[PDB]
């Protein structure tokens, strides 16, 4: 622990701190969530998570030299908090958690988008609850309306030549996580077609030239699933 230190973090996070004071608090909490056992994460709990999500909302609502670092450090704290079942369960109990992870998919902050996309991908493949992919898509829809963009555009932007290989891989990994776990053939075919129409068709040609095994693994999953679906439609 200590257990007392968890309560101290909550009190600090609720205190109205900003800028580098906030980042310094977040960095200390990120270490504690990584180094302490799950029991400590449970002591920090739903209330600790809620304090983190309230700040992240505020950071969006007020459009700050430290904003992008504070948003990403919060995402790092969520990455640690969600590295166990209790954390996952507690995040999925929130009303706004998934939406805030989707709003973290900003390709202009690529390492934050990578971290958030990985967390989302892991939710989608969970045995339970089922159909987390649907909740992710609901939140992508809400973000699209709020940002006035097409809903898959952030994922496409992540695949543009110019981005890091790690971001490209995380984008295609989330695409696969949205499609592959779905039981309904016609839904898989639909989503795939929506991505193709937005521009994935052209992008894929560029991705296949990349000599990176992690990319090849995701392209393989994507192409096979596509092939099976079209087979099943005949």
């Amino acid at each position: 622990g200590s257990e007392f230190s968890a309560m101290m973090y909550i009190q600090e996070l609720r205190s109205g701190l900003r800028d580098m004071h906030l980042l310094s608090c977040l960095e200390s909490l990120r270490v504690s969530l990584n180094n302490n056992p799950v029991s400590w994460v449970q002591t920090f709990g739903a209330e600790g998570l809620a304090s983190l999500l309230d700040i992240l909302k505020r950071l969006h609502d007020e459009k700050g030299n430290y904003d992008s670092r504070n948003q990403h450090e919060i995402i790092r704290c969520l990455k640690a908090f969600m590295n166990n079942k209790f954390g996952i369960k507690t995040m999925l109990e929130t009303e706004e958690g998934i939406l805030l992870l989707v709003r973290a998919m900003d390709p202009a902050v690529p390492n934050m988008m990578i971290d958030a996309a990985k967390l989302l991908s892991a939710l989608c493949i969970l045995p339970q609850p089922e159909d987390m992919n649907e909740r992710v898509l609901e939140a992508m829809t809400e973000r699209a309306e709020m940002d006035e963009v097409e809903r898959f555009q952030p994922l496409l932007d992540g695949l543009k030549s110019g981005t890091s290989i790690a971001l490209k891989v995380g984008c295609l990994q989330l695409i696969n996580a949205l499609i592959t776990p779905a039981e309904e053939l016609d839904f898989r075919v639909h989503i795939r077609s929506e991505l193709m129409r937005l521009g994935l068709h052209q992008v894929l040609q560029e991705l296949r030239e990349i000599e990176n095994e992690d990319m090849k693994v995701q392209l393989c999953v994507f192409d096979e699933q596509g092939d099976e679906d079209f087979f099943d439609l005949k």
């Binding site: 990994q173 996580a177 999953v221 096979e224």
Partner: peptide, 15 residues
């Protein structure tokens, strides 16, 4: 099924 093996490969990639 082939889809379930694929899901397992996605999980292994995330780990």
């Amino acid at each position: 099924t082939p889809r379930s093996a694929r899901l397992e490969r996605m999980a292994q990639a995330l780990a």
